[PDB]
Coordinates of C-alpha atoms in Angstrom, one line a residue:
Chain A
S597 CA -35.9 -20.5 4.9
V598 CA -36.5 -21.2 1.2
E599 CA -35.3 -18.2 -0.9
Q600 CA -31.9 -18.6 0.5
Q601 CA -31.3 -21.9 -1.3
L602 CA -33.5 -20.7 -4.2
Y603 CA -31.1 -17.8 -4.9
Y604 CA -28.2 -20.2 -4.2
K605 CA -29.6 -22.8 -6.7
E606 CA -30.1 -20.6 -9.7
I607 CA -27.0 -18.5 -9.2
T608 CA -24.8 -21.6 -8.9
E609 CA -26.5 -23.1 -11.9
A610 CA -25.9 -20.0 -13.9
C611 CA -22.4 -20.1 -12.5
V612 CA -21.9 -23.5 -14.0
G613 CA -24.0 -23.4 -17.2
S614 CA -22.5 -21.4 -20.1
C615 CA -25.6 -19.2 -20.9
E616 CA -23.3 -16.3 -21.6
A617 CA -25.8 -13.4 -21.1
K618 CA -27.1 -15.1 -17.9
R619 CA -23.4 -15.7 -17.0
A620 CA -22.6 -12.0 -17.2
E621 CA -25.9 -11.0 -15.7
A622 CA -25.3 -13.2 -12.6
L623 CA -21.9 -11.5 -12.4
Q624 CA -23.4 -8.0 -12.4
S625 CA -26.0 -9.3 -10.0
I626 CA -23.4 -10.3 -7.4
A627 CA -21.6 -7.1 -8.1
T628 CA -24.8 -5.1 -7.5
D629 CA -26.1 -6.7 -4.4
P630 CA -27.3 -4.6 -1.5
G631 CA -27.0 -7.0 1.5
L632 CA -26.3 -10.3 -0.1
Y633 CA -24.6 -12.0 2.7
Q634 CA -25.3 -15.0 4.9
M635 CA -25.2 -16.7 1.6
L636 CA -21.5 -15.8 1.5
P637 CA -20.3 -18.7 3.7
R638 CA -22.0 -21.4 1.6
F639 CA -21.0 -19.4 -1.4
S640 CA -17.3 -19.4 -0.7
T641 CA -17.4 -23.0 0.5
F642 CA -18.8 -23.9 -2.9
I643 CA -16.0 -21.9 -4.5
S644 CA -13.4 -23.8 -2.6
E645 CA -14.6 -27.2 -3.2
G646 CA -15.5 -26.6 -6.8
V647 CA -12.0 -25.3 -7.2
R648 CA -10.7 -28.6 -5.8
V649 CA -13.0 -30.5 -8.2
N650 CA -12.0 -28.6 -11.2
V651 CA -8.4 -29.0 -10.2
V652 CA -9.0 -32.7 -10.5
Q653 CA -11.1 -32.2 -13.6
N654 CA -9.0 -29.5 -15.3
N655 CA -11.9 -27.6 -16.8
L656 CA -10.5 -24.1 -17.5
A657 CA -14.0 -22.7 -18.4
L658 CA -15.2 -23.4 -14.9
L659 CA -12.0 -21.9 -13.6
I660 CA -12.5 -18.6 -15.3
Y661 CA -16.2 -18.8 -14.1
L662 CA -15.1 -19.2 -10.5
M663 CA -12.6 -16.4 -10.9
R664 CA -15.2 -14.1 -12.2
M665 CA -17.3 -15.2 -9.3
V666 CA -14.5 -14.1 -6.9
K667 CA -14.1 -10.9 -8.9
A668 CA -17.8 -10.2 -8.3
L669 CA -17.5 -11.0 -4.6
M670 CA -14.7 -8.5 -4.5
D671 CA -16.8 -5.8 -6.0
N672 CA -19.3 -5.4 -3.5
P673 CA -19.0 -2.2 -1.5
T674 CA -21.1 -3.9 1.1
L675 CA -19.3 -7.3 1.5
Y676 CA -17.1 -7.3 4.5
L677 CA -15.2 -10.2 3.0
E678 CA -12.8 -10.4 5.9
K679 CA -13.6 -13.4 8.0
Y680 CA -14.0 -15.7 5.0
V681 CA -11.0 -14.6 3.1
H682 CA -9.0 -17.6 4.3
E683 CA -11.1 -19.8 2.1
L684 CA -10.7 -17.6 -1.0
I685 CA -6.9 -17.4 -0.8
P686 CA -6.3 -21.1 -1.2
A687 CA -9.0 -21.2 -3.9
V688 CA -7.2 -18.3 -5.5
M689 CA -3.7 -19.5 -5.3
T690 CA -4.3 -23.2 -6.0
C691 CA -5.6 -21.9 -9.4
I692 CA -2.1 -20.5 -9.7
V693 CA -0.6 -24.0 -9.2
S694 CA -1.9 -27.0 -11.1
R695 CA 0.5 -29.5 -12.2
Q696 CA 0.2 -28.8 -16.0
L697 CA -2.6 -31.4 -16.1
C698 CA -4.8 -29.9 -18.8
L699 CA -4.2 -30.2 -22.5
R700 CA -1.2 -28.1 -23.5
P701 CA -1.3 -25.5 -26.2
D702 CA -3.8 -22.7 -25.7
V703 CA -4.0 -23.4 -22.0
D704 CA -0.6 -21.6 -21.7
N705 CA -2.4 -18.4 -22.6
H706 CA -5.2 -19.5 -20.4
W707 CA -2.5 -19.9 -17.8
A708 CA -1.9 -16.2 -18.7
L709 CA -5.6 -15.7 -18.2
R710 CA -5.2 -17.3 -14.8
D711 CA -2.8 -14.4 -14.3
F712 CA -5.9 -12.3 -14.6
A713 CA -6.8 -14.2 -11.4
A714 CA -3.4 -13.1 -10.0
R715 CA -4.7 -9.6 -10.5
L716 CA -7.3 -10.5 -8.0
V717 CA -4.5 -11.3 -5.6
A718 CA -3.4 -7.7 -5.5
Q719 CA -7.1 -6.8 -5.4
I720 CA -7.3 -8.9 -2.3
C721 CA -4.3 -7.6 -0.5
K722 CA -4.9 -3.8 -1.0
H723 CA -8.1 -4.3 0.9
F724 CA -6.8 -7.0 3.3
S725 CA -3.3 -6.6 4.5
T726 CA -5.0 -4.8 7.4
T727 CA -4.2 -7.8 9.6
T728 CA -2.1 -8.2 12.6
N729 CA -0.1 -7.9 9.5
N730 CA -0.1 -11.3 8.0
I731 CA -1.4 -11.5 4.5
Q732 CA 1.3 -10.0 2.2
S733 CA 4.0 -11.7 4.2
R734 CA 2.3 -15.0 3.8
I735 CA 1.7 -14.8 0.0
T736 CA 5.1 -13.4 -0.7
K737 CA 6.9 -16.1 1.3
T738 CA 4.8 -18.6 -0.7
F739 CA 5.8 -17.0 -4.0
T740 CA 9.4 -16.9 -2.8
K741 CA 9.6 -20.6 -2.1
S742 CA 7.9 -21.0 -5.4
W743 CA 10.3 -18.8 -7.3
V744 CA 13.7 -19.8 -5.9
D745 CA 13.9 -23.5 -6.2
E746 CA 14.4 -26.0 -8.9
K747 CA 12.1 -29.0 -9.3
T748 CA 9.7 -26.2 -10.1
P749 CA 7.4 -26.6 -13.2
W750 CA 6.5 -23.9 -15.6
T751 CA 3.0 -23.7 -14.3
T752 CA 4.4 -22.9 -10.8
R753 CA 7.2 -20.6 -11.8
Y754 CA 5.0 -18.8 -14.4
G755 CA 2.1 -18.2 -12.0
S756 CA 4.4 -17.2 -9.1
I757 CA 6.1 -14.7 -11.4
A758 CA 2.6 -13.5 -12.3
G759 CA 1.5 -13.1 -8.8
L760 CA 4.6 -11.1 -7.9
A761 CA 4.0 -9.1 -11.0
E762 CA 0.6 -8.2 -9.9
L763 CA 2.0 -7.3 -6.5
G764 CA 3.7 -4.4 -8.2
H765 CA 6.5 -2.0 -8.1
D766 CA 9.1 -2.7 -5.4
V767 CA 8.2 -6.4 -5.4
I768 CA 9.8 -6.5 -8.8
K769 CA 12.5 -4.0 -7.9
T770 CA 13.7 -6.0 -4.9
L771 CA 12.6 -9.6 -5.5
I772 CA 12.7 -10.3 -9.2
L773 CA 15.9 -8.3 -10.0
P774 CA 18.3 -10.8 -8.1
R775 CA 17.8 -14.2 -9.7
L776 CA 16.5 -12.6 -12.8
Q777 CA 19.8 -13.6 -14.5
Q778 CA 19.9 -17.1 -13.0
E779 CA 16.4 -18.0 -14.2
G780 CA 17.3 -16.4 -17.5
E781 CA 20.1 -18.9 -17.6
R782 CA 17.5 -21.6 -16.7
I783 CA 15.6 -20.5 -19.8
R784 CA 18.8 -20.3 -21.8
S785 CA 19.3 -24.0 -20.8
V786 CA 15.7 -24.5 -22.0
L787 CA 16.9 -22.6 -25.0
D788 CA 19.6 -23.9 -27.4
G789 CA 19.6 -27.6 -26.3
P790 CA 16.8 -30.1 -26.7
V791 CA 13.7 -29.4 -28.7
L792 CA 10.7 -31.6 -27.9
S793 CA 9.5 -30.3 -24.6
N794 CA 7.4 -27.7 -26.3
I795 CA 5.1 -27.3 -23.3
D796 CA 8.2 -26.3 -21.5
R797 CA 9.6 -24.3 -24.5
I798 CA 6.6 -22.1 -25.1
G799 CA 6.1 -22.0 -21.3
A800 CA 9.5 -20.4 -20.8
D801 CA 8.8 -18.3 -23.9
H802 CA 5.8 -16.5 -22.4
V803 CA 7.7 -16.5 -19.1
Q804 CA 10.2 -14.3 -21.0
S805 CA 7.2 -12.3 -22.1
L806 CA 6.1 -11.9 -18.5
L807 CA 9.6 -10.9 -17.5
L808 CA 10.2 -8.4 -20.2
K809 CA 6.7 -6.9 -20.6
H810 CA 6.2 -6.6 -16.9
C811 CA 9.8 -5.9 -15.6
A812 CA 10.8 -3.1 -18.1
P813 CA 9.3 -0.1 -16.2
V814 CA 11.1 -0.5 -12.9
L815 CA 14.4 -0.6 -14.6
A816 CA 13.2 2.3 -16.8
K817 CA 12.9 4.2 -13.6
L818 CA 16.1 2.9 -12.0
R819 CA 18.6 2.3 -14.8
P820 CA 19.0 5.5 -16.9
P821 CA 18.3 4.9 -20.6
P822 CA 21.6 4.9 -22.3
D823 CA 23.7 1.8 -22.8
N824 CA 21.4 -0.9 -24.1
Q825 CA 24.1 -3.5 -24.8
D826 CA 25.7 -2.7 -21.4
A827 CA 22.3 -3.2 -19.8
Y828 CA 22.3 -6.5 -21.5
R829 CA 25.7 -7.1 -19.9
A830 CA 24.2 -5.7 -16.7
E831 CA 21.1 -7.9 -16.9
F832 CA 22.4 -11.1 -18.6
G833 CA 22.1 -10.4 -22.3
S834 CA 18.7 -11.8 -23.4
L835 CA 16.3 -9.2 -22.0
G836 CA 18.4 -6.5 -23.7
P837 CA 18.0 -4.6 -25.8
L838 CA 14.3 -5.4 -25.8
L839 CA 14.6 -4.3 -22.2
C840 CA 15.9 -1.0 -23.4
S841 CA 13.6 -1.0 -26.4
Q842 CA 10.5 -1.6 -24.2
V843 CA 12.1 1.0 -21.9
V844 CA 12.0 3.5 -24.9
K845 CA 8.4 2.4 -25.4
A846 CA 7.6 3.0 -21.8
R847 CA 9.3 6.4 -21.8
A848 CA 7.1 7.2 -24.9
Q849 CA 4.0 6.0 -23.0
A850 CA 5.0 8.2 -20.1
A851 CA 5.6 11.2 -22.4
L852 CA 2.3 10.5 -24.3
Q853 CA 0.4 12.5 -21.6
Chain B
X1011 CA -20.7 -26.4 13.5
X1012 CA -20.5 -22.8 14.7
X1013 CA -17.1 -22.0 16.0
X1014 CA -16.4 -20.5 19.4
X1015 CA -16.5 -16.7 19.5
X1016 CA -13.1 -15.0 19.2
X1017 CA -11.0 -13.2 21.8
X1018 CA -8.9 -10.2 20.9
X1019 CA -5.1 -9.7 21.5
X1020 CA -5.9 -7.4 24.3
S1021 CA -7.1 -8.0 27.8
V1022 CA -9.9 -5.8 29.0
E1023 CA -7.4 -4.4 31.5
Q1024 CA -4.8 -3.5 29.0
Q1025 CA -7.3 -2.2 26.5
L1026 CA -8.5 0.1 29.2
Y1027 CA -4.9 1.0 29.8
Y1028 CA -4.8 1.7 26.1
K1029 CA -7.8 4.0 26.5
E1030 CA -6.0 5.8 29.2
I1031 CA -3.1 6.2 26.8
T1032 CA -5.3 7.6 24.1
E1033 CA -7.2 10.1 26.2
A1034 CA -3.9 11.2 27.7
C1035 CA -2.8 11.8 24.2
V1036 CA -5.9 14.0 24.1
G1037 CA -4.9 15.2 27.5
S1038 CA -5.0 19.0 28.3
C1039 CA -3.1 18.6 31.5
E1040 CA 0.6 18.5 30.6
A1041 CA 1.3 16.4 33.6
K1042 CA -1.0 13.8 32.1
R1043 CA 0.7 14.5 28.8
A1044 CA 4.2 13.8 30.1
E1045 CA 2.9 10.8 32.1
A1046 CA 1.7 9.4 28.8
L1047 CA 5.0 10.2 27.1
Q1048 CA 7.0 8.4 29.7
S1049 CA 4.5 5.5 29.7
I1050 CA 5.1 5.2 26.0
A1051 CA 8.8 5.5 26.0
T1052 CA 9.3 3.1 29.0
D1053 CA 6.9 0.3 28.6
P1054 CA 9.1 -2.4 27.1
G1055 CA 7.4 -5.7 26.6
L1056 CA 4.2 -3.9 25.7
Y1057 CA 4.4 -5.0 22.1
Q1058 CA 0.9 -6.2 21.9
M1059 CA -0.8 -2.9 22.3
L1060 CA 1.3 -2.3 19.2
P1061 CA 0.1 -1.9 15.8
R1062 CA -3.7 -1.5 16.5
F1063 CA -2.6 1.4 18.6
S1064 CA -0.3 2.9 15.9
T1065 CA -2.6 1.9 13.1
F1066 CA -5.5 4.1 13.8
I1067 CA -3.1 6.5 15.3
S1068 CA -2.1 6.9 11.7
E1069 CA -5.7 6.9 10.7
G1070 CA -6.4 9.7 13.1
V1071 CA -3.4 11.5 11.5
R1072 CA -5.1 11.3 8.1
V1073 CA -8.5 12.4 9.5
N1074 CA -7.0 15.3 11.4
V1075 CA -4.9 16.3 8.3
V1076 CA -8.4 16.8 6.9
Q1077 CA -9.4 18.5 10.1
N1078 CA -6.2 20.6 9.9
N1079 CA -5.6 20.9 13.7
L1080 CA -2.1 21.6 15.0
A1081 CA -2.8 20.4 18.6
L1082 CA -3.6 16.8 17.5
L1083 CA -0.5 17.1 15.3
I1084 CA 1.9 18.0 18.0
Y1085 CA 0.4 15.4 20.3
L1086 CA 0.8 12.7 17.7
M1087 CA 4.3 13.7 16.7
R1088 CA 5.6 13.7 20.3
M1089 CA 3.7 10.5 20.6
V1090 CA 5.7 9.1 17.7
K1091 CA 8.9 10.4 19.3
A1092 CA 8.1 8.5 22.5
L1093 CA 7.3 5.5 20.3
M1094 CA 10.7 5.8 18.7
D1095 CA 12.6 5.7 22.0
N1096 CA 11.0 2.7 23.6
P1097 CA 13.9 0.5 22.8
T1098 CA 12.4 -3.0 22.9
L1099 CA 9.4 -2.4 20.6
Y1100 CA 11.1 -2.9 17.3
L1101 CA 9.8 -0.9 14.5
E1102 CA 10.6 -2.9 11.4
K1103 CA 7.5 -4.9 10.6
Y1104 CA 5.2 -2.1 11.7
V1105 CA 7.1 0.7 10.0
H1106 CA 5.1 0.8 6.9
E1107 CA 1.9 2.5 8.0
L1108 CA 3.7 5.1 10.2
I1109 CA 6.3 7.0 8.1
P1110 CA 3.8 8.3 5.5
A1111 CA 1.9 9.9 8.3
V1112 CA 5.1 11.6 9.3
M1113 CA 5.7 12.8 5.8
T1114 CA 2.1 14.0 5.4
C1115 CA 2.8 16.0 8.5
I1116 CA 5.8 17.3 6.7
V1117 CA 4.4 18.3 3.3
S1118 CA 1.7 21.0 3.2
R1119 CA -1.4 22.8 4.2
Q1120 CA -1.2 22.7 7.9
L1121 CA -3.4 25.7 8.0
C1122 CA -5.4 26.3 11.1
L1123 CA -5.2 30.0 10.6
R1124 CA -3.2 32.1 8.2
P1125 CA -1.6 34.3 10.9
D1126 CA -1.1 31.1 12.9
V1127 CA 1.1 29.2 10.4
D1128 CA 4.0 30.0 12.8
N1129 CA 3.7 26.9 15.0
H1130 CA 3.5 24.7 11.9
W1131 CA 7.0 25.5 10.9
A1132 CA 8.2 24.3 14.3
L1133 CA 6.0 21.3 13.7
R1134 CA 7.8 20.6 10.5
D1135 CA 11.2 21.1 12.2
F1136 CA 10.2 18.6 14.9
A1137 CA 8.9 16.2 12.2
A1138 CA 12.0 16.3 10.1
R1139 CA 14.0 15.8 13.3
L1140 CA 11.9 12.7 13.8
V1141 CA 12.7 11.5 10.3
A1142 CA 16.4 12.0 11.1
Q1143 CA 15.9 9.8 14.1
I1144 CA 14.3 7.3 11.8
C1145 CA 16.8 7.2 9.0
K1146 CA 19.7 6.0 11.2
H1147 CA 18.3 2.5 11.7
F1148 CA 16.5 1.1 8.6
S1149 CA 18.1 1.9 5.3
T1150 CA 20.7 -1.0 5.6
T1151 CA 18.0 -3.1 4.0
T1152 CA 15.8 -2.2 1.1
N1153 CA 16.4 1.5 0.7
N1154 CA 12.8 2.8 1.1
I1155 CA 14.3 5.2 3.8
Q1156 CA 17.2 6.9 2.2
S1157 CA 16.5 6.5 -1.5
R1158 CA 12.7 7.0 -1.4
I1159 CA 12.7 9.9 1.0
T1160 CA 15.6 11.6 -0.7
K1161 CA 14.1 11.2 -4.2
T1162 CA 10.7 12.3 -2.7
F1163 CA 12.2 15.5 -1.4
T1164 CA 14.2 15.8 -4.6
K1165 CA 11.3 15.8 -7.0
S1166 CA 9.3 17.7 -4.3
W1167 CA 11.9 20.5 -4.5
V1168 CA 11.6 20.3 -8.3
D1169 CA 7.9 20.8 -8.0
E1170 CA 7.2 24.4 -9.2
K1171 CA 4.0 26.3 -8.4
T1172 CA 3.6 24.6 -5.0
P1173 CA 3.0 26.3 -1.6
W1174 CA 6.2 27.1 0.2
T1175 CA 5.2 24.8 3.1
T1176 CA 6.1 22.0 0.7
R1177 CA 9.5 23.7 0.0
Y1178 CA 10.2 24.2 3.7
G1179 CA 9.3 20.7 4.7
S1180 CA 11.3 19.2 1.8
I1181 CA 14.5 21.2 2.5
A1182 CA 14.2 20.8 6.2
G1183 CA 13.9 17.0 5.8
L1184 CA 17.0 17.1 3.6
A1185 CA 18.7 19.2 6.2
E1186 CA 18.0 16.7 8.9
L1187 CA 19.5 13.9 6.8
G1188 CA 23.0 15.2 7.5
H1189 CA 26.1 17.2 6.6
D1190 CA 27.1 15.4 3.5
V1191 CA 23.5 15.2 2.3
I1192 CA 23.3 19.0 2.2
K1193 CA 26.8 19.1 0.8
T1194 CA 25.5 17.1 -2.2
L1195 CA 22.2 18.8 -2.4
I1196 CA 22.6 22.5 -1.7
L1197 CA 25.8 22.7 -3.6
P1198 CA 23.8 23.8 -6.8
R1199 CA 20.7 24.6 -4.7
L1200 CA 22.8 27.4 -3.0
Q1201 CA 22.4 29.7 -5.9
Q1202 CA 19.3 28.0 -7.3
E1203 CA 17.4 28.6 -4.1
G1204 CA 19.0 32.1 -4.0
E1205 CA 17.3 32.5 -7.4
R1206 CA 14.1 31.3 -5.6
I1207 CA 14.8 33.9 -2.9
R1208 CA 15.1 36.8 -5.2
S1209 CA 12.1 35.5 -7.1
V1210 CA 10.3 35.9 -3.8
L1211 CA 12.3 38.9 -2.5
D1212 CA 11.9 41.9 -4.7
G1213 CA 9.3 39.8 -6.3
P1214 CA 5.5 40.1 -6.4
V1215 CA 3.1 43.0 -6.1
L1216 CA 1.4 41.9 -2.8
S1217 CA 0.9 38.5 -1.2
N1218 CA 2.2 39.1 2.3
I1219 CA 1.1 35.8 3.7
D1220 CA 3.2 34.0 1.1
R1221 CA 5.9 36.8 1.3
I1222 CA 6.3 36.5 5.1
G1223 CA 6.0 32.7 5.0
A1224 CA 8.6 32.1 2.2
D1225 CA 10.8 34.9 3.6
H1226 CA 11.2 33.5 7.1
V1227 CA 11.4 30.0 5.5
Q1228 CA 14.3 31.1 3.3
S1229 CA 16.0 32.8 6.2
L1230 CA 15.6 29.7 8.4
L1231 CA 16.9 27.3 5.8
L1232 CA 19.7 29.8 4.9
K1233 CA 21.2 30.0 8.4
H1234 CA 20.4 26.3 9.0
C1235 CA 22.2 25.3 5.8
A1236 CA 25.1 27.6 6.8
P1237 CA 27.1 25.2 8.9
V1238 CA 27.7 22.9 5.9
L1239 CA 29.6 25.5 3.9
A1240 CA 31.0 26.8 7.1
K1241 CA 32.5 23.4 7.7
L1242 CA 33.3 23.3 4.0
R1243 CA 34.7 26.7 3.2
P1244 CA 36.9 28.9 5.2
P1245 CA 35.2 32.1 6.3
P1246 CA 37.2 34.5 4.0
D1247 CA 36.0 36.9 1.4
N1248 CA 32.4 37.4 2.3
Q1249 CA 31.8 39.8 -0.6
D1250 CA 33.2 37.0 -2.9
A1251 CA 31.3 34.3 -1.0
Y1252 CA 28.0 36.3 -1.6
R1253 CA 29.0 36.2 -5.3
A1254 CA 29.7 32.5 -4.6
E1255 CA 26.2 32.3 -3.1
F1256 CA 24.1 34.6 -5.3
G1257 CA 24.2 37.6 -3.1
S1258 CA 21.1 37.2 -1.0
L1259 CA 22.9 34.9 1.4
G1260 CA 25.3 37.7 1.9
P1261 CA 25.8 38.8 4.5
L1262 CA 23.4 36.7 6.5
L1263 CA 25.6 33.8 5.4
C1264 CA 28.5 35.9 6.5
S1265 CA 26.8 36.7 9.8
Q1266 CA 26.1 33.0 10.3
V1267 CA 29.8 32.4 9.4
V1268 CA 30.7 34.9 12.2
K1269 CA 28.4 32.9 14.5
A1270 CA 30.1 29.7 13.4
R1271 CA 33.5 31.2 14.1
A1272 CA 32.2 32.2 17.5
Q1273 CA 30.9 28.6 18.1
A1274 CA 34.4 27.4 17.1
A1275 CA 35.9 29.9 19.5
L1276 CA 33.6 28.4 22.2
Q1277 CA 35.5 25.2 21.8
Chain C
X90 CA -3.1 -4.7 36.5
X91 CA -1.9 -3.1 33.2
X92 CA 1.1 -5.3 33.2
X93 CA 0.7 -8.3 35.4
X94 CA -2.9 -9.5 35.3
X95 CA -5.0 -10.3 32.2
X96 CA -8.6 -10.7 31.2
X97 CA -10.9 -12.2 28.6
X98 CA -12.6 -10.8 25.6
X99 CA -16.0 -11.9 24.2
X100 CA -16.5 -8.6 22.4
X101 CA -19.8 -9.3 20.6
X102 CA -23.1 -8.8 22.4
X103 CA -25.2 -7.2 19.5
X104 CA -28.4 -8.1 21.3
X105 CA -30.7 -5.3 20.2
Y106 CA -34.0 -7.0 19.6
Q107 CA -36.0 -4.8 17.2
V108 CA -32.7 -3.9 15.5
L109 CA -32.0 -7.6 15.1
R110 CA -35.2 -8.4 13.4
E111 CA -34.9 -5.3 11.3
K112 CA -31.6 -6.7 10.1
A113 CA -33.1 -10.1 9.3
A114 CA -36.2 -8.7 7.6
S115 CA -34.2 -6.2 5.6
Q116 CA -31.9 -9.0 4.5
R117 CA -34.9 -11.1 3.4
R118 CA -36.2 -8.1 1.4
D119 CA -32.7 -7.9 -0.2
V120 CA -32.7 -11.5 -1.2
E121 CA -36.3 -11.0 -2.6
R122 CA -35.3 -8.1 -4.8
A123 CA -32.0 -9.8 -5.8
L124 CA -33.6 -13.0 -7.1
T125 CA -36.3 -10.8 -8.7
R126 CA -33.6 -8.8 -10.6
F127 CA -31.9 -12.0 -11.6
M128 CA -34.8 -13.8 -13.1
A129 CA -36.0 -10.5 -14.3
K130 CA -33.2 -10.0 -16.7
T131 CA -32.8 -13.8 -17.2
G132 CA -36.1 -15.2 -18.6
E133 CA -39.0 -14.0 -20.7
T134 CA -39.6 -10.5 -19.7
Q135 CA -42.7 -8.3 -20.2
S136 CA -42.8 -4.8 -18.8
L137 CA -45.1 -2.2 -17.3
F138 CA -43.9 0.8 -19.3
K139 CA -42.0 0.3 -22.5
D140 CA -38.5 -1.1 -22.1
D141 CA -37.9 -1.2 -18.4

């Protein structure tokens, strides 16, 4: 009919334009829709191809717009999102890719804000590993081939670490623990040598931030909290004793209840 | 461009075969029950009436945990046993929505009726026995099995002010893990759980549900824990061994040691 | 037949006439009230009571 594309028109136009109250009101609209679907296929299709566009165009504002859009799609307790999820997951994870092709500086933290999007990933999989069990295996193999190799930029490694971080506890316990020390040596090579790849320098710096201030609590459970310098010896120096210091902070946060 | 409509993994034939499987799991006739059990345990190459089957089997486990019905429990747990012995259908990938249903069957509140908690102890026995059958295959990898279930039952045993069904299921699951497991665990828990015994025994004013429950639980776990220290210690000085086991084990520990000496004399 | 032969699954008939058009019309009502709420809080708004 008509109102289909009317609704589609103004909610896409509010999705693109930066009218900030209308922005957030469209988001609460999508979050509070009884029976908004059948617009969902065109909706997601728009999300996918606009993602590809803004990959080519590198407009971070549209990226966080689309991510909030996906967040809103997620928060319908009516939207059986299932059959269409295969369009979102590229549109999610490609946002966890791109080839560092924005301007540098603040975008790093915006890369961190794309890790907000990585939160969505877990907020996908909790509701959608229900498969002939496919989804978690898929994404984790993807992050694995991301995480292991060299010829891997800091966008890629950073966001892969972020997605595994949002996957949670034993992902970090089993998967990040092994080549923790080797990638720490990768950053130690990024450390202490050349200077003027400061994209890569501050990239690896807030990589270290991800590693420490996401990977502390699993060792806080596992490794008992004596022996800070030995834990540095047990986990390649650099994370210690800020590993143990953040572990003391996490034990304090646990005992705060 | 509207795609062709889907087709399931099933056939109509084998999903009706699956419906026969399910309603024989309901089945009152024990011939139909055993037929189902053999059909589970010896249909290799089935593999494709796998997880969907087991998945809302586990969902039915949760819903009937809410419904608190022992018959559905025993049917599902013998069903999982027959699932465990069908040798081709490898468990690995599909493990991780099954084992928590087993442990939810272990933990607590299987309360159809308060005079009828009796069968639930045997349910927990059978369940921990199933866990023992699980644990010998999967902890080579990631140690969800041994480390997580042991620390689960560890901190579960630490959990004070919980119903003794939790205590029984925990200690029974640790008992099923093996000789050296109990050798580690009930070395301090010998006299610490004896302190729990004589907190229960010669304890409250009146709660005879909990009294009779915890009492037979402590008796069961006492003489079931007994072959460890029987294999560990020689059966001398039962008066000293009761002092070595906080008294309440004596002489039921000594009677079980006499039974163990009789079992050795049977050899 | 439970091992040897197989079958085919179409699995979605859903042809309940009055129920179908109930679904469609209810969904139309949904999109009505959705766009109403959207441009309601979007544009120039005047009320019926005070501050609705």
